[PDB]
Ligand binder design. Sequence first.
Ligand SMILES: C[n+]1cn([C@@H]2O[C@H](COP(=O)(O)OP(=O)(O)O)[C@@H](O)[C@H]2O)c2nc(N)[nH]c(=O)c21
Length: 163
Amino acid sequence: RQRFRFGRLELKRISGRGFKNDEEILIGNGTIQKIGIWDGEEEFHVRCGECRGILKKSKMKLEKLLINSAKKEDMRDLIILCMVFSQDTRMFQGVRGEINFLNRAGQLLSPMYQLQRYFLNRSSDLFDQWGYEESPKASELHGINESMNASDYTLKGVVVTKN
Ligand SMILES: C[n+]1cn([C@@H]2O[C@H](COP(=O)(O)OP(=O)(O)O)[C@@H](O)[C@H]2O)c2nc(N)[nH]c(=O)c21
């Protein structure tokens, strides 16, 4: 279970096993792109900068992300990166602009890394497409909105702890 990266995101497996299959994904800008889609419930310690979290995913779905509160920019990037890494259907649909899967020399680019790069610059569109649900009714857990503020609605599947 060794530490590994997905760009700015760092992960370490807690549980589960994924199996990858290539699928044709309809992305939110109207294009269809072939992307390795993971199947399986998997769970990971995650990190971005000084922000720690726990992520659970299943096929094309962020099941849950529990983050330990931290500087806001690092909370926000951790959230964006977990949305991309979960391969959630809503994340794909959130892409409204152009995305290239070849560079200017005609070289091959990673669809997932390209998504990461796209969304770290377009998080408002992502949060807007992703949506909100009621925050937890427990004292030791709080909701978080698009501004990384504690709120009565939280990004779906995302909760913050101070413990
Ligand atoms: C080894 N390991 C790699 N990743 C991710 O899967 C994606 C691989 O995408 P890629 O690097 O473009 O390779 P590919 O086109 O051959 O599919 C990246 O986002 C990796 O972070 C993985 N993702 C999951 N869910 N489970 C894993 O065990 C795992």
